[PDB]
Amino acid sequence: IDDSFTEGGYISVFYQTRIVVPLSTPREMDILGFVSACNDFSVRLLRDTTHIEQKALAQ
Amino acid sequence: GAQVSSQKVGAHINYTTINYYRDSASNAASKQIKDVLIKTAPMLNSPNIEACGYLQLTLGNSTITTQEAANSVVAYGRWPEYLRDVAACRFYTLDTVSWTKESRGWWWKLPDALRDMGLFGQNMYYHYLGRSGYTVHVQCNASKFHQGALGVFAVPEMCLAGDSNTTTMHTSYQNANPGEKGGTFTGTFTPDNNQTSPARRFCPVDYLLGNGTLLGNAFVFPHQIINLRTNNCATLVLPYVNSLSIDSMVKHNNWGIAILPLAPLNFASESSPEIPITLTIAPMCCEFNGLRNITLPRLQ
Amino acid sequence: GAQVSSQKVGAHINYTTINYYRDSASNAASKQIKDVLIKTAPMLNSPNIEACGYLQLTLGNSTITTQEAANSVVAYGRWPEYLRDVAACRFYTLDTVSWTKESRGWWWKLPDALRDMGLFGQNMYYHYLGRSGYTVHVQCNASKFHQGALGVFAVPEMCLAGDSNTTTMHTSYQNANPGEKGGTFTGTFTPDNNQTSPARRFCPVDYLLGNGTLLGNAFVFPHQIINLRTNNCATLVLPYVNSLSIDSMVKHNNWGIAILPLAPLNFASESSPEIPITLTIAPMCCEFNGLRNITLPRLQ
Amino acid sequence: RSGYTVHVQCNASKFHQGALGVFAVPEMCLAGDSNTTTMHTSYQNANPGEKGGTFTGTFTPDNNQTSPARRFCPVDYLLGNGTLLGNAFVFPHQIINLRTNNCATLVLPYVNSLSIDSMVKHNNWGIAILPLAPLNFASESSPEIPITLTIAPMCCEFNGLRNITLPRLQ
Amino acid sequence: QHRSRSESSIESFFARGACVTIMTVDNPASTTNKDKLFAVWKITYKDTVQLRRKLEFFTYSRFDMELTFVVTANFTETNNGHALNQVYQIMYVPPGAPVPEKWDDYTWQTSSNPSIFYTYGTAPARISVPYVGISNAYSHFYDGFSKVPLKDQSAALGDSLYGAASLNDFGILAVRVVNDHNPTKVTSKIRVYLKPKHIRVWCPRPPRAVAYYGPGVDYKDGTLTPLSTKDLTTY
Amino acid sequence: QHRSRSESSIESFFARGACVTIMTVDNPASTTNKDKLFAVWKITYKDTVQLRRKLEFFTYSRFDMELTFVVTANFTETNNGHALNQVYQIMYVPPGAPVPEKWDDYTWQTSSNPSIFYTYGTAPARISVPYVGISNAYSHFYDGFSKVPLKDQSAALGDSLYGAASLNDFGILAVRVVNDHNPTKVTSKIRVYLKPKHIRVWCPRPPRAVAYYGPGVDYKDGTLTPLSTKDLTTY
Ligand SMILES: CCCCCCCCCCCCC/C=C/[C@@H](O)[C@H](N)CO
Ligand SMILES: CCCCCCCCCCCCC/C=C/[C@@H](O)[C@H](N)CO
Ligand SMILES: *C(=O)CCCCCCCCCCCCC
Ligand SMILES: *C(=O)CCCCCCCCCCCCC
């Protein structure tokens, strides 16, 4: 959860030099980005998620 | 028969168990470096024809000529195999489609897409049961001045969402099964409001993989990317996947092929470019069973 | 797996145990001369640089010249050590304070008090994480005709009480962290009544160690006494103490140094005497981690 | 004392052309702007910091007698030091030919008449980057491309700790 | 030292009882013009959302199952009268067997069907079921049809629902208050908690990102925009 | 012969269940204009004073924990009507999980969260929790802040409470009467008793000498003079 006490820091991306293209070629392009966990990774204390719900449910 | 074993401890002693019942079902639940970059379970991560130990790709009289191969993947790390304990099964090239600056994506289903392919199709309809794996070869070339990226996804049991908001699970057999022709993705959900005379077909939204899940996560499925910059073709080797050893090829589709523009097609400067995408697919280690008179479907 | 063992008996036979569960947490609680003057647990009693096996006291280019040493103490019997499995860390002398017939006491916090000390301070603010132990050398001389006694206390997690009675835990970061300057004790609690524009700072009552506990018992903490009669200086060797192996030096202060007049300063016959108290502190076995752009705090 | 890894970064397209000469000069003393007095460039001007400092095609004598500019005037073909640029290659160097490569890496040792020295008073190495062959592109009358320098100090060590030096850099 | 991945093992992940349904029954005054209420629930993991989303991380699964029953009751009318302790009968009616039409009828004799007789106020009832699938694994998704439309035969006959296999996979739970009609009425509720034991899972899938809309993968207009606004260059 | 120090060992010292809180819930008549009352308690040892003072003899601690629940109920109105036996649901909502907004809602499905279904009149409920700290030890005192005020950013953003780490350390206990609204109303109370097992403690401190005043070390004017009058030369 977002919590200052256990904050993790900042990822940011920059132009080191610049994107350079020749004539007759597109001046704008896209980058895709991906994330995953490394094998040193683990989690604890199983819990219910907020990423789905039945609000209409009644239990 | 008392069973003694090590307790689940911290990191600075054990417990005892006896089974009281005859059926295992009654039993309690029995609870069970150097380089981080390495995958715990590789096979779940889309390996290569190379990466498990396995150019001219050839089946029967049909043959692909490929340098591209680091661009291949063996689904779930598992190679096609015979139901253990034929040149109807060869490479069939389907109708070529066109990728444009506004395409949202394309889908197909197996075996369905191959239902009319020579002796394969025949064999499929003359038998009750059939099983098969596949080699899917997606072909799409452009120039060094073109750009774009195709996400090629192989989905097991690829159930897609329907056009209706008044009734559910109602897409007709005819509509669900497009054959070779294809079937396509859309950018927005458009509810079939014609109550009285229902369209009874799918409405697959691209960013939701046509199934209620986010496209960005579609990569947990056996896949491959065609980045126009680096490669012009992708090869997916698909195993027979199912809750059964063999099934009805006519009633049930095992795999779904989804192709979506991860990055939009672009060229030099033309306001509206185009390039072709050709699919060549081959059934593998395939076998049929329960021969009788031919199935004549109401495909329409 | 039944575990048999001796029963808790008087002084003129045993019981049996079996663990039913897989998690140790589920387990029941497992219950475990000549010279009286000797301490059961010495380390809890404030040992000497001498008393655990360990004069010119020197770190890098900095060096104390000390005869005084029976006057030293190693907190919790534990010597500073590297986070296991640098000359920014040397002796820094802070601004000298003045002890008078009416001083109630002084306090400081580590690392805070050292936040502006040369390369140490720099290292602290350029890194996410840092850990360090300390050597605290309290200097205070007088004549054979002066009298008084200073209680030098090193408190782990020295949380101090605030000025407000309408709201709690509200002392501002700025006020909580005085830097080298200090921070001082008071003889009486004076509630910050300015509702609208709150002082937001500590109000540390001397006889309550500024934290709700009686000063007379402050000796359960790593400490040392400067009795003007017998010695003019005290040396406390402090280990890194924390619920973590390493932490944020900027957000969290590990140790608190409290200096209080156990016995009031007095001289010959002067109605109002004075003598200086100088603190020289050195970080020890210290290490930092998680380098990035510098932290620029709003200290004001 | 310290050594260095100098990494010069400069990319272009297959249709661009040009060549950069990257020179690492030991004791790179540069010539001054004055013709009335010698060895007179101010500490401030001699030491530009990260900012840089640049070469010129022609010598322009600081004629303001009364209130002197007191700075360098480095002529390109003379390596800013009275020697011919064509011979600058006897110095540790590397070439960035836009045709073949987009970056250069120079690993520099500590060089000096001493084992260790004052980093504040004395500069050990000089990095000089000059266009051996001029930048050109497709057909644009006036092209541009970026050059980024990433530098790392190596096997480095310091000595004689005390209060901080606060230079009058201005 | 060293972190364990144990609590994220497939068993540990599902090692919890989840509410899969709430059944309502009652026991009315004999006089009453309206019928005594008994419950008939069709067994499924899809009536509630949480266990469903978790299972659907996977295409195919295999597991022994544990059902636990929490029964609560209460008074309906102001009445002020009372009722003696209730006993409940939880009968499992497998696909094929006679489904009860009345709190009263012969089906409750339960000679071959499994029944649980629960006494109100006692520890929640509990049983285990083996992996009862007719296939080698339970199928969380079926991209296909129950039956194929034959050109020959008529259009209506050849038709069936998309994604559905048997009209009746696992049969049903029938519940009743065994006690006879009582002067003052009591309404009761049965909560069915499901936990998968001894579990195995195959062929992973992305989690459901938009609200469920029935037993299938279908989605509803107006529920399709899960993600929140957040600008590109903003931490 | 020879005296043992066993009953004063750190375990023996804490080897007792202590009341850490009293939760109130109810089950009202359906008619009622006011909502059915369910309890939401934020887990802590600081709401009561005795266990707190004992733990605070120490700076840092480490222990497995045992919670025991005593549930009592009673009638609110003169009424004279009655209610059938109540079943309580004690759900643990860990930091991050959906907190219940209604006695009714979906959160109570409890698919992944731990819940205790307690039957009124039965032996007090009880569970064990491991050492769940994210640090190497529970910290009884934190001389610091949650976050550092950056000169750059605005004053308000950089601010936080003194001595506090996470806005939510251990999450919360949510409690409800599972039974449906009853004509005649019953109010219940849940008493939570806490006992530290398998305990270790570090860095000792003097006991709290003056009345506690909130979650921190703060003291209140007028409570600062604990000690009694007694003259120097008087036995
Ligand atoms: C006295 C009570 C007896 C209760 C007996 C229950 C037996 C029926 C168990 C069915 C378990 C179904 C679990 C989910 C199955 C489904 O995944 C699918 N649609 C798979 O093919
Ligand atoms: C079904 C009931 C499950 C109950 C689960 C309870 C889990 C949460 C346990 C937290 C224990 C906290 C003990 C005291 C911790 C605190 O000392 C501190 N502020 C330390 O950092
Ligand atoms: C192996 O199990 C032999 C040792 C068994 C210990 C005897 C006590 C077990 C009591 C329960 C058995 C009856 C349960 C069906
Ligand atoms: C070691 O424990 C072997 C001897 C065990 C004696 C058998 C009787 C124990 C009965 C309880 C076991 C079941 C509890 C999970």
Q: Which ligand is nearest to the CA of E163?
A: 1
Minimal-distance CA residue to ligand 4 atom 7:
B2
Sign for the pseudo-dihedral over CA of F80, F85, F87, F88? positive
CA-nearest of C32, C52, C50, C53 to C42 is C52
Contacts of E20 (CB under 8 A, 6+ apart): E44, E45, E47, E48, E51, E192, E193, E194
CA-nearest of C179, C300, C167 to F161 is C167
Contact D146 A23 (CB under 8 A): no
Count of Cβ atoms closer than 10 Å to residue B186 Cβ: 14
Closest residue of chain A to D14, computed from CA coordinates:
A22
* Angstrom distance (rounded) from CA C19 to CA C27: 7
Atom of ligand 4 nearest to the CA of B16: 2
Pocket test of ligand 2: the residue of F89, F117, F139, F170 to mutate, having most ligand atoms within 8 Å of its CB, is F170
Peptide bond into F183 cis (omega under 30): no
Asked if F219 and F210 count as a contact pair (C-beta separation under 8 A), the reply is yes
CA-nearest of F197, F141, F134 to F171 is F134
Compute the distance from residue B169 Cα to the ligand 1 centre, in Å: 21
DSSP E149-179: -BSSS-TTTT---BT---TTSS-EEEEEE-S
User: For chain F, what's the residue count?
Assistant: 235
Using the Cβ of F129 and the Cβ atoms of chain A, whether some distance falls under 8 Å is answered with: no
How far away is chain A from the Cα of B146, in angstroms, using its nearest Cα? 8
CA distances (Å), origin E87, targets B176, C43, C227, D133: 49, 65, 82, 98
* Angstrom distance (rounded) from CA B175 to CA B184: 12
* Angstrom distance (rounded) from CA B204 to CA B183: 9
Pocket flag, ligand 4, residue C1 (CB < 6 Å): yes
Asked if B121 and B112 count as a contact pair (C-beta separation under 8 A), the reply is no
Q: Which of A14, A15, A16, A17 to mutate to test the interface with D (most CBs of D within 10 A)?
A: A17
Q: What's the count of helices (H) and strands (E) in chain E, helices before strands?
A: 2, 9
3 state SS of D45:
helix
How much is the CA Rg of chain C, to the nearest whole Å? 23
Contacts of D122 (CB under 8 A, 6+ apart): none
DSSP B48-62: -TTTTT--EEEETTE
How far away is chain E from the Cα of F232, in angstroms, using its nearest Cα? 56
Run of H or E residues at F52: helix F50-55
Minimal-distance CA residue to ligand 3 atom 13:
B20
How much is the CA Rg of chain D, to the nearest whole Å? 18
Burial string for F102-139 (b: 16+ CB within 10 Å, else e) reads bbbbbbbbbbbbbbbbbbbeeeebeebbbbeeeeebbb
Contacts of D3 (CB under 8 A, 6+ apart): D107, D108, D109, D110, D153, D154, D155, D156
CA distances (Å), origin C75, targets B47, C154, D88, F140: 57, 8, 63, 19
Contacts of D60 (CB under 8 A, 6+ apart): D33, D73
Structure solved via: X-ray
CA distances (Å), origin C204, targets C188, C213, E160, F218, F223: 8, 11, 79, 10, 15
User: How, if at all, do strands C14-17 and C3-6 pair?
Assistant: antiparallel
Q: Which ligand is nearest to the CA of C4?
A: 4
Contacts of E117 (CB under 8 A, 6+ apart): E87, E88, E89, E90, E178
Contacts of F230 (CB under 8 A, 6+ apart): none
Pocket flag, ligand 2, residue F93 (CB < 6 Å): no
3 state SS of F129:
strand
CA-nearest of F73, F88, F67, F86 to F21 is F67
- Partner residues linked to E118 by β-bridges: E88
Count of Cβ atoms closer than 10 Å to residue B11 Cβ: 7
* Angstrom distance (rounded) from CA C2 to CA B192: 69
Q: Which domains does chain D have, with CATH numbers?
A: 1-170 (2.60.120.20)
C229 φ/ψ angles, rounded to the nearest 5 degrees: -60, -45
* Angstrom distance (rounded) from CA D53 to CA D76: 13
* Angstrom distance (rounded) from CA B230 to CA F123: 69
CA distances (Å), origin B281, targets B93, B109, B114, C84, E104: 6, 11, 8, 58, 61
Tell me how many residue pairs between chain C and chain F have CB atoms under 8 A apart: 174
CA-nearest of F150, F169, F170, F171 to F159 is F150
* Angstrom distance (rounded) from CA E205 to CA E215: 17
F6 φ/ψ angles, rounded to the nearest 5 degrees: -55, -45
Compute the distance from residue E177 Cα to the ligand 1 centre, in Å: 24
Q: Which domains does chain F have, with CATH numbers?
A: 1-235 (2.60.120.20)
Task: Record the tokens describing residue F196, joined without a space.
Answer: 């530290």
Minimal-distance CA residue to ligand 3 atom 3:
B1
- Strands in chain E per DSSP E: 18-27, 39-42, 58-75, 87-93, 115-119, 125-129, 138-139, 172-177, 186-204
Asked if D25 and D108 count as a contact pair (C-beta separation under 8 A), the reply is no
Amino acid in the structure at residue D66: T
CA-nearest of A55, E213, E149, E145 to B191 is E213
The separation between the first and the last C-alpha atoms of chain B, rounded to the nearest angstrom, is 65
* Angstrom distance (rounded) from CA B271 to CA B257: 29
CA-nearest of B67, B24, B22, B77 to B47 is B77
* Angstrom distance (rounded) from CA C74 to CA C58: 17
Q: What is the DSSP code (8-state) at residue F10?
A: H
Q: What is the DSSP code (8-state) at residue C240?
A: P
Minimal-distance CA residue to ligand 2 atom 9:
F170
Count of Cβ atoms closer than 10 Å to residue C230 Cβ: 11
Task: Record the tokens describing residue B81, joined without a space.
Answer: 């195999």
Asked if F195 and F58 count as a contact pair (C-beta separation under 8 A), the reply is no
Contact D14 A20 (CB under 8 A): no
Asked if E224 and B205 count as a contact pair (C-beta separation under 8 A), the reply is yes
CA-nearest of D105, D101, D98, D75 to D88 is D75
| Alpha helix ranges (H) inside chain C | 118-126, 173-176
Chain A residues with at least one Cβ partner in F under 8 Å: 1, 3-7, 45-50, 53-55, 57-59
Task: Record the tokens describing residue B112, joined without a space.
Answer: 């369905």
Q: What is the DSSP code (8-state) at residue C148?
A: E
CA-nearest of D133, D131, D138 to D22 is D131
Resolution (A): 2.8
* Angstrom distance (rounded) from CA F94 to CA F174: 10
* Angstrom distance (rounded) from CA B114 to CA B92: 8
Minimal-distance CA residue to ligand 2 atom 11:
F170
> Of all residues in chain B, what percent are helix, strand and coil, respectively (each to 5)?
15, 35, 50
Pocket flag, ligand 2, residue F69 (CB < 6 Å): no
Asked if F8 and F184 count as a contact pair (C-beta separation under 8 A), the reply is no
CA-nearest of C251, C276, C263, C267 to C124 is C251
| Chain A residues within an 8 Å CB radius of F107 | 48, 59
Q: What is the DSSP code (8-state) at residue F6?
A: G
Count of Cβ atoms closer than 10 Å to residue E8 Cβ: 14
Contact B15 C2 (CB under 8 A): no
Largest CA distance in chain C: 78
Q: Which residue has the tokens 């520890």?
A: E123
CA-nearest of E46, E65, E12, E34 to E214 is E46
Contacts of E101 (CB under 8 A, 6+ apart): E107
Using the Cβ of A17 and the Cβ atoms of chain D, whether some distance falls under 8 Å is answered with: yes
Tell how far CA D77 is from the center of its chain. 14
* Angstrom distance (rounded) from CA C240 to CA C153: 16
CA-nearest of B121, C160, E183 to F218 is C160
Using the Cβ of B143 and the Cβ atoms of chain C, whether some distance falls under 8 Å is answered with: no
Contacts of E232 (CB under 8 A, 6+ apart): none
E177 φ/ψ angles, rounded to the nearest 5 degrees: -85, 110
* Angstrom distance (rounded) from CA B170 to CA A43: 40
Amino acid in the structure at residue C30: S
- Strands in chain B per DSSP E: 3-6, 14-17, 56-59, 62-65, 72-74, 92-93, 97-100, 106-110, 127-139, 146-156, 223-227, 233-238, 255-267, 274-291
- Partner residues linked to E116 by β-bridges: E90
Q: Which residue has the tokens 């896209």?
A: A30
* Angstrom distance (rounded) from CA C209 to CA C186: 10
Q: What dihedral do alpha carbons C166, C167, C169, C172 form, nearest 10°?
A: -90
Q: Which residue has the tokens 């939204």?
A: B205
Task: Please give the angle made by the CA atoms of D86, D87 and D90, to the nearest 5 degrees.
Answer: 140
* Angstrom distance (rounded) from CA D93 to CA B24: 76
Pocket flag, ligand 1, residue E209 (CB < 6 Å): no
Q: Which ligand is nearest to the CA of B22?
A: 3
Count of Cβ atoms closer than 10 Å to residue B66 Cβ: 15
Tell me how many residue pairs between chain A and chain E have CB atoms under 8 A apart: 37
Q: What is the DSSP code (8-state) at residue A34?
A: -
* Angstrom distance (rounded) from CA C282 to CA C23: 45
Asked if E49 and E212 count as a contact pair (C-beta separation under 8 A), the reply is yes
Compute the distance from residue B2 Cα to the ligand 4 centre, in Å: 6
CA-nearest of F111, F113, F91 to F102 is F91
Run of H or E residues at C163: none
Count of Cβ atoms closer than 10 Å to residue F31 Cβ: 8
- Strands in C207-251 per DSSP E: 223-227, 233-238
